[PDB]
Design a protein around this nucleic acid. Sequence first.
RNA 1: ACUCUGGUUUCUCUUCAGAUCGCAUAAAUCUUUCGCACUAAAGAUUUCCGUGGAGAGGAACAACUCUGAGUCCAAUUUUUUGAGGCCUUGCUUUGGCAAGGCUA
Lengths: 84, 77, 852, 98, 74, 73, 235
Amino acid sequence: MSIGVPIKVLHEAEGHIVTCETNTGEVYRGKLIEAEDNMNCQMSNITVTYRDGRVAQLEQVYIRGSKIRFLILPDMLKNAPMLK
Amino acid sequence: MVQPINLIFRYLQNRSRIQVWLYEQVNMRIEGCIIGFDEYMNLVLDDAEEIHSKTKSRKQLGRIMLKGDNITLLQSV
Amino acid sequence: MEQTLPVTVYEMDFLADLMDNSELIRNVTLCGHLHHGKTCFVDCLIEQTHPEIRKRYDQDLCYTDILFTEQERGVGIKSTPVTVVLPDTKGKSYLFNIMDTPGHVNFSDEVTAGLRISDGVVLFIDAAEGVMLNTERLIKHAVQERLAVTVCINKIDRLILELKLPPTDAYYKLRHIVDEVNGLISMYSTDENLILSPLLGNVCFSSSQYSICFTLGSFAKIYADTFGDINYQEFAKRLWGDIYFNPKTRKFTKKAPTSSSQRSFVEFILEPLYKILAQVVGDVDTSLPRTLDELGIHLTKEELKLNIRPLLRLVCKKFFGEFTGFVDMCVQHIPSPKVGAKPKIEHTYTGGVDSDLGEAMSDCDPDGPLMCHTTKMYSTDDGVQFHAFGRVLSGTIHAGQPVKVLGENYTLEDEEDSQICTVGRLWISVARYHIEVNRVPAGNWVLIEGVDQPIVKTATITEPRGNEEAQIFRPLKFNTTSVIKIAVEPVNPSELPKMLDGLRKVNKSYPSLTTKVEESGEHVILGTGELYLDCVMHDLRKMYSEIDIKVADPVVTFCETVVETSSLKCFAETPNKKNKITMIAEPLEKGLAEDIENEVVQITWNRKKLGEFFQTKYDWDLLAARSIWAFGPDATGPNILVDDTLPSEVDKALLGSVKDSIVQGFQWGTREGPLCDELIRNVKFKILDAVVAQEPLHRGGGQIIPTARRVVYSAFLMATPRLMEPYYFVEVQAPADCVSAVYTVLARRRGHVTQDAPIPGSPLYTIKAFIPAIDSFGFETDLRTHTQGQAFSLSVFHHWQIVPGDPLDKSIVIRPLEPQPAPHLAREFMIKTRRRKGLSEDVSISKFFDDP
Amino acid sequence: EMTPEELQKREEEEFNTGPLSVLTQSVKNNTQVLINCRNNKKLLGRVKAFDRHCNMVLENVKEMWTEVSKPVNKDRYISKMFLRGDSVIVVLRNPLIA
Amino acid sequence: KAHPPELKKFMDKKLSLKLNGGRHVQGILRGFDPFMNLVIDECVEMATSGQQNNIGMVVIRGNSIIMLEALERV
Amino acid sequence: SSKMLQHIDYRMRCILQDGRIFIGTFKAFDKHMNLILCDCDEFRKREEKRVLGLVLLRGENLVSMTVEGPPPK
Amino acid sequence: KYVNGSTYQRWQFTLPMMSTLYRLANQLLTDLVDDNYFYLFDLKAFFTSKALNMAIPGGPKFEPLVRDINLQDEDWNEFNDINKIIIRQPIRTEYKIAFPYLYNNLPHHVHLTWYHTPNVVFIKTEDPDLPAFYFDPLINPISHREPLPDDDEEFELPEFVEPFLKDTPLYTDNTANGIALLWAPRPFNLRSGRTRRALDIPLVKNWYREHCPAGQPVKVRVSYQKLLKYYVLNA
RNA sequence: ACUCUGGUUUCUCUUCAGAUCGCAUAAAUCUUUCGCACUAAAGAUUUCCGUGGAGAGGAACAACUCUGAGUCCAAUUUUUUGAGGCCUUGCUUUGGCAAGGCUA
Ligand SMILES: Nc1nc2c(ncn2[C@@H]2O[C@H](COP(=O)(O)OP(=O)(O)OP(=O)(O)O)[C@@H](O)[C@H]2O)c(=O)[nH]1
Ligand SMILES: [Mg+2]
């Protein structure tokens, strides 16, 4: 009644390797440490593909969830209990 | 640990030369003498001025109510 | 997959996928005292994660305790692993490998087999009984096995429904329990960063009878789901511990307002819990539906017709919901096992973290070199095949994959205790069903089929054709000493092989079981007590060998000590007549045997730190302290081998030529001993002189090992030898009136009462006593019969004390079937053991000399 | 909000005294309205109703938008429309010519 | 019901903020609100012209903040 | 809000604010229109199909959902 | 409201009714809060003792279930060598019932008794003018003596909130009675039940199932033991 | 927050019930074991006392409590906008797309 299913799947994706695209086209693949009700994602050990194609290694990242276009989660969470 | 609107209150207590950046407008920033804020970070500036980066012709604005939905960054001097 | 598993809240594909991500795994041992709520807590977690598995109304489903002797005795006997997927307070599902360990202190070894494969501990404490014997012993063994310790104060309903304490005074009870656990952890650990408080989330409060389980965060989240705008973690920071609530300023203060206000725990947590339990048990018919409406709980009309205990369990299952405070506590405060891999490898791996394989085991990666470690062997109920249970610390076991099992005697130079075994099947072991898997990645627990043959107690499974420098994990250092000794023969000797087969099987099932054959052909089982050996004997006669087996009387293993230095400096030449060794044996300093046994010293140290210890602690010269060769029968045994050979009289390189064989003979001599072939204890063996032969085919090996044993024996016997009794520390939980009855029961059995102290907040007393373990046979039966069941005792091994007799006393006549008096008990204890051993009738001090 | 009352008609004190009152005028005056909206378009019509998000129902609208060629201004006539109100820049009562 | 962004991991840390219009900034975090406006000590501006501009204590609106990178090890 | 509970597990096409297409199995949604789509293939223009997996699409960037195919077995 | 109907098959009772019925039946019930009292005196203990041809002292005595090993017919092996046996205390009958696999050669048809159940520390309430939740003087006192957040921190509890059942009293006038009904013997721990025949209710079965009291003559003691004998033969 | 089930009691029948079918406990018979069988044990069968469930049939009064189902949010974080306009190439399906630079 209060919290939705996709934020439960986002909380279920913590510890896993998620790849989050942001509003400025930058793709961040790495270990999602923590995520909140708003989609503020503290992630770590991040491989970053910018818009040009350059890849950087940013070891501790906190993305503001407003700017997140989407996150690609592991398909393990296709069997997560809140997706039933 | 400093919370931000406390430092805005300290800014107006200092009446600093607050330069405010803009959302999505990277060219034009605004100098000012900050007087008042609110719950939603609307800012009134006493002698506010537009500064470009290509033009850099500082235009004086007077006391403005710059909306909270437009600011990015409140630096000093 | 491919098996018929029960209906569960999660699904097994998600469990098998949480197995891969080893950040979402918690290897947890639920350990505590006897009957402190661990099996019922696992029952509550199983009922949470399995909708079709439900506890009966009048009788608790255990769901571990899957043995017949566990179901009949009511005492947990073996550790049952349960792998569930439990959701957290934030809703995040973590894989939980839970070891439900027996809380009976005799089965403490079983807890050690769970403590090895765990990264954390939930110590279960009865809120009524408080901290008991095995809770102190498992605090000690949990912070000494380098495990993160959390506390579940189970049975808080006994504060409400039994003691009927006021909520302030039951808060004082829970606070006293948390303070007692903090004092025990500060006692057994120099670090004070592992303070246990419910403010930190380290302490959970529970009632596994009624499915109450909350930390402060999970009780604060009930407020956060009832009232929206509150952030529950900041609230949980204020709920416990002399913080009062000001409802006019709406703020939590340390200063008490009104001079009769309650703490935040009493106001916000304990009084709602009391009002829930009091409205259920007292006012079901009158005023339960309006308070249930106030709590948001609606029960069906069929559900309100329940009796008061199932209705309590149901009301608190609807109020508290899932056991997310347990998952809060074990996720915030028990490592990852990715984080917990490095203390596990530093503590339990023999190569240490600094090895090339210790690094790759600290990384805990499933695509690494396979380094599984099994501590438990679980028999299938046909009794024939065992399944080795343990955790994968690196790599991935696969079903059908050939594998290299290393036993406990595998060193890298003695590579013969290994065997290449084909792994048959892999199971994720929940208690009453096994999820058959194709592979098990690192960090996870696994039942392995097919590796059971080359191992007895403890294995390191590696892979063949790689990991050539793979060492074993350390054997299970047990909490206690298997002391009670029973002889075991078949009724019909023709079915001796079945019994021998069964003896091997109980050696696999019970981790601190010692099955040996003495020189008389007598088969001997060592156990920790009479319940332990009763279950061993049940499994021996019923599970493994289906034959009839005579048991002897329970006896104890004795130790052997000296009380003064040896009279003449004893010597022994080899059968070559070269290589004379000349030793004296003197008693160790007080507390030194406790220091060698509890690893306060090691011979694995360098000579500088070891000599510095023995100089600064026991007034040894650095001449003597730099001359320590070995440490008793094992590397941590209560004897010391020193050489006081001056380098003037002895060539020191020629002495280091045979240091290994003299050490081997000394270790074998202290392992058997000349009085009754039972371990020498607390004896310093000083090599005074050593002639050594010059060429190496005249010294070494078959000459100097038995010669060193003979000079250890003669140096021991010329010092005045005493037998040592094992003493059981007995913690009796009696009523206040039965204390003088406990004293009376102990006075008939040579037991000295250390203390009789009131359990604070309970009407019971704890009588702590020291009985001899030879006098503890039927002591708990004597106590519970004499007190009409009101007193109850748990007795565990504490120390060895010198028997009041003198064992080398031929002046003493012993009529064979009489209880001897104290001043010649040692003379009874020495020769009967010698008869049991079958050695000669008496040992003379001149048996191992060269003069006769 | 420090006004949590159930009987909230302050939102049309807003529509009689405040800034959005300009459109309740064209609810009552039935006046033609020019709307400068976000895709550089102009919507002239007559708003029948609206409230606090400035979403308006407009009747008989001429909408103007100019194209590049360098700009020629095109037109299309629409019967009657719902307009989501964050999709405006400015709203204008069309002036008194007389 | 606006929970604060979970940033005591990042207190007193050297972070590089990305701001909205392709912009960038560096500095020490000193606090936040539930709206993720950040207050920053030792702020170096670091524009795309390439020359690094120190300011000091600044406040950044949380609307404009794309990402935090903790340059210091948390 | 049963108008999209009618569409759960249907293979849906989600046109986004940049113009990218998300053809994924519509698993879940919430009040903010954040979608959980599994086995989601991105379609962009020059045609190419880019498999992603379990996409948690934030609701800010979703324009329009439409069904591509019936739910699988 | 209180029974099934005219067939008189199921009853459901209010807990004041069960409390006052428990008080009216106080003389027929032993006020044990445990089955620890029946340690080595329960049915399993007696099944064990019957199977081992041993008699628990307060308990029954049967014919031997198996033909006994005559310990003057066994012929001094190395196992039963009495010169090897350390005697400290006589290994009683009770020890062979308590641990039937440790202390018996050939434990056949033997029953592992229940071990300790944890001591139900239930304080019976003598005074109803006392609160139901009350620090009774049977309870040993708790001698008094924390990462607390500062009072300067701005955590406020919001206006709607207070503890969960603040209007509810902590105890009522029938709370201690219901707590006493939790530790009441069967049928008084029930509040619903199925109706039993008057034949089927032995009013004094849990009397000979206790130990026979002190100071009793020999005929009532053998009567207790033979009532136990036919109780155990029935079960 | 509007509508359609289901009731409860009692009498009887039929079938299943190794579940404490019974929080109680009988008797008979057979077999075995020792005594030398009320004062004795085991195993098995049977009968009784008399249960639970399901199904069915009657007849008494209740009919929508219960078990279900059908039936107040524009100010950062999502849904009341940083939106729209210019320049080069690859192809133009000559509509324009894609990438980048911009300007606001
Ligand atoms: N009053 C009360 N009793 C409980 C509670 N939890 C369990 N018990 C009872 O206490 C006894 C403890 O048994 P278990 O919990 O199964 O045993 P254990 O704690 O795992 O300890 P082990 O016997 O060594 O395995 C059981 O008979 C339960 O009925 C509780 O929360 N409150
Ligand atoms: Mg247990």
